[PDB]
Amino acid sequence: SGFRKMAFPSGKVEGCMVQVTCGTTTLNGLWLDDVVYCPRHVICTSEDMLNPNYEDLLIRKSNHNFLVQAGNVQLRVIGHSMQNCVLKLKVDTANPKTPKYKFVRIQPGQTFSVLACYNGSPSGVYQCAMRPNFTIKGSFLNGSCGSVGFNIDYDCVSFCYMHHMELPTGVHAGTDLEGNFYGPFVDRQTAQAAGTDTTITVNVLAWLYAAVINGDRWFLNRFTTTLNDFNLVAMKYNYEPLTQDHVDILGPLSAQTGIAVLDMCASLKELLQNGMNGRTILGSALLEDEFTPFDVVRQCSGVTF
Amino acid sequence: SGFRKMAFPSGKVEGCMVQVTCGTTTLNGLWLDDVVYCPRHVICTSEDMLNPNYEDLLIRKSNHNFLVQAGNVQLRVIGHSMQNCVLKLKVDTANPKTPKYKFVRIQPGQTFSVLACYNGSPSGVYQCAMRPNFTIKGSFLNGSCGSVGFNIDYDCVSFCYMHHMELPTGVHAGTDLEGNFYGPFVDRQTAQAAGTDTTITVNVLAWLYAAVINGDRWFLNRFTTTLNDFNLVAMKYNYEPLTQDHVDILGPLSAQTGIAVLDMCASLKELLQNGMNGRTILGSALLEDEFTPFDVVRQCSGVTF
Numbered sequence: 121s122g123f124r125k126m127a128f129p130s131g132k133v134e135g136c137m138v139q140v141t142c143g144t145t146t147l148n149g150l151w152l153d154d155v156v157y158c159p160r161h162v163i164c165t166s167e168d169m170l171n172p173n174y175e176d177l178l179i180r181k182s183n184h185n186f187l188v189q190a191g192n193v194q195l196r197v198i199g200h201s202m203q204n205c206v207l208k209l210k211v212d213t214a215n216p217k218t219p220k221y222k223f224v225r226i227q228p229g230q231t232f233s234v235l236a237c238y239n240g241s242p243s244g245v246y247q248c249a250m251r252p253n254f255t256i257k258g259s260f261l262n263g264s265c266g267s268v269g270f271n272i273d274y275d276c277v278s279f280c281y282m283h284h285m286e287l288p289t290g291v292h293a294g295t296d297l298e299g300n301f302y303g304p305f306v307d308r309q310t311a312q313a314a315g316t317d318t319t320i321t322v323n324v325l326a327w328l329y330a331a332v333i334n335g336d337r338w339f340l341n342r343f344t345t346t347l348n349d350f351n352l353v354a355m356k357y358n359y360e361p362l363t364q365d366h367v368d369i370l371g372p373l374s375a376q377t378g379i380a381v382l383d384m385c386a387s388l389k390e391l392l393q394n395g396m397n398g399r400t401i402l403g404s405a406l407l408e409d410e411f412t413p414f415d416v417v418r419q420c421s422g423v424t425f
Numbered sequence: 426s427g428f429r430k431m432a433f434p435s436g437k438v439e440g441c442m443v444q445v446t447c448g449t450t451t452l453n454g455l456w457l458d459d460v461v462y463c464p465r466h467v468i469c470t471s472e473d474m475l476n477p478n479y480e481d482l483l484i485r486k487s488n489h490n491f492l493v494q495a496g497n498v499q500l501r502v503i504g505h506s507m508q509n510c511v512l513k514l515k516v517d518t519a520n521p522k523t524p525k526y527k528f529v530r531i532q533p534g535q536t537f538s539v540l541a542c543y544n545g546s547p548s549g550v551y552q553c554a555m556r557p558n559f560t561i562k563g564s565f566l567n568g569s570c571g572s573v574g575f576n577i578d579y580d581c582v583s584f585c586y587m588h589h590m591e592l593p594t595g596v597h598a599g600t601d602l603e604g605n606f607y608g609p610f611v612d613r614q615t616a617q618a619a620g621t622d623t624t625i626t627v628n629v630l631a632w633l634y635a636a637v638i639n640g641d642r643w644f645l646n647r648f649t650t651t652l653n654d655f656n657l658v659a660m661k662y663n664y665e666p667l668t669q670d671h672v673d674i675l676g677p678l679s680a681q682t683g684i685a686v687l688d689m690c691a692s693l694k695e696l697l698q699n700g701m702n703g704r705t706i707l708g709s710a711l712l713e714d715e716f717t718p719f720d721v722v723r724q725c726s727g728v729t730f
């Protein structure tokens with residue numbers, strides 16, 4: 121038992137990480153079949169970053185301007201293309217270590233594992249949520265760009281995130297693997313505000329279920345409440361509204377602990393209005409919102425890859 | 426920038442995980458060269474667990490009593506041996522995916538990555554400290570045993586932990602890969618005491634350095650203190666004593682932030698005696714002790730594998 125912030129095994133993704141160089145600029149690429157995916161700002165100097173014309177900069181580039189290294193091996197680029205904010209470099213060799221993969225666009229509150237990379241070499245793996253405002257609280261130094269976020273489904277890697285930049289407060293912004301930013305962000309060095317972030321309510325309830333499952337029960341109360349009553353309180357504390365969809369998603373956990381979703385909502389209400397008053401839940405002194413209901417079941421029932 | 430609990434890339438360890446079955450009992454094995462390492466309690470029924478004689482139970486077993494699956498493939502056991510609390514099954518095949526590895530025994534406060542496994546299949550990867558009392562706060566269900574903890578050194582996997590059991594309060598106990606328990610624990614189903622745990626002081630100071638590096642500086646003071654002065658306060662809060670060795674280890678971070686170790690010790694003193702007054706440090710509401718000074722530099726300077 122016990123509850124940890126757990127990332128998926130990075131193996132399948134490690135064998136897709138390559139180094140992409142264009143003049144000065146070197147960052148990380150994702151090699152799937154005979155295609156290498158990287159942020160398009162690989163073609164920029166740090167001067168260009170104030171206001172780049174990516175169309176113009178790319179027109180000036182040819183295949184041999186793009187160096188791709190997969191460990192010690194060099195990959196012959198035989199074509200290049202720009203899809204939104206990612207670059208697609210066609211290469212002579214299909215990746216022998218290509219896993220079964222999809223590209224998916226995750227929704228706010230959904231979580232994924234980041235494999236942080238520098239020079240196409242895996243550095244470390246951690247777990248993230250897409251925040252309500254479409255930022256992520258990641259760990260990224262310079263060179264990290266092209267590092268990707270993913271979920272695993274037995275054998276199938278679903279790629280949801282490629283990292284492009286840091287914002288004010290050093291939160292992070294990036295794209296799906298089709299190169300569309302999450303949120304209103306642009307791959308340009310300007311003033312960009314993320315705007316107010318909210319707590320992922322369905323995730324906090326999942327986490328309280330994880331607590332109860334692990335013997336952390338001090339916060340359970342006699343009260344129940346209406347979905348309506350609860351939301352009126354949640355709005356006040358910058359919690360995202362709880363929907364019938366969220367209640368239906370929390371059902372199996374409801375059923376495994378024998379605590380009605382609206383019973384737990386009543387518990388959460390107390391904690392928001394009264395505070396945790398010095399005490400802890402699964403050793404955290406604040407309410408944790410980066411475990412989905414699927415994360416809690418995966419971990420608490422132990423699904424394997 | 427930003428600071429996360431980061432595990433090492435699990436790839437090299439995923440290709441060493443196999444499934445070991447002995448009658449009823451199925452748990453995880455580590456396949457390195459032509460040897461599979463697992464907890465010796467694989468040979469126990471839940472009756473034997475109250476008070477096993479492992480010598481006698483093993484005498485009763487032959488090679489064909491041991492089923493080893495590496496994915497879909499079956500491995501012929503051609504010898505079996507007991508080293509303390511691990512079982513060494515000799516097999517016909519050397520592991521083609523064996524990485525460069527050492528076996529090391531870590532010290533209290535040292536951290537490592539756990540690859541949690543069920544039926545020899547990687548489930549998830551997270552970061553742990555060996556607590557002062559030689560427990561770990563992991564996440565382990567039934568079937569998890571034989572899951573291992575490791576650090577990576579560029580290309581070399583150092584294995585330090587194999588998981589054997591849960592204790593009271595659902596903390597976890599295990600062995601090095603030579604089969605010697607960390608702490609006073611035995612592989613037997615009895616009531617076992619971990620005894621008092623202490624906060625890993627050198628790790629909390631490393632973490633405060635990580636904070637300052639990431640713009641979290643509200644807790645800085647002008648004060649300094651003696652090692653002796655500081656320890657007289659630390660003892661009171663069940664913090665491990667800070668040694669000159671700890672001060673010397675914190676030097677590079679000292680140098681990167683330009684804050685003398687004993688200046689930061691004076692900051693920590695304030696936080697213990699005054700509390701955090703409801704504010705946060707790297708988004709934590711308590712003081713974090715599971716980042717080593719090496720962890721903080723790895724992440725904050727971005728070292729690669």
Ligand SMILES: *[C@H](CC(=O)OCC)[C@H](C[C@@H]1CCNC1=O)NC(=O)[C@H](CC#C)n1cccc(NC(=O)c2cc(C)on2)c1=O
Binds near residue numbers: 265284306
């Ligand atoms: C990409 C790193 C890389 O490999 O690309 C160049 C080799 C980085 C990732 C950053 C670096 C620090 N932490 C991260 O998460 N992204 C950028 O550097 C982007 C590139 C683009 C497009 N970029 C460029 C220029 C400026 C900024 N950021 C800011 O202007 C800014 C403002 C505030 C406040 O904080 N940052 C940027 O992200």
Ligand SMILES: *[C@H](CC(=O)OCC)[C@H](C[C@@H]1CCNC1=O)NC(=O)[C@H](CC#C)n1cccc(NC(=O)c2cc(C)on2)c1=O
Binds near residue numbers: 597
């Ligand atoms: C090994 C799992 C495995 O793969 O082996 C079975 C095929 C488990 C790991 C445990 C299960 C729950 N969480 C874990 O970390 N280890 C055991 O089950 C060990 C076996 C040995 C040796 N074991 C056996 C019997 C009892 C206990 N538990 C306790 O002593 C205990 C007391 C209190 C309170 O909490 N736990 C045990 O770990």
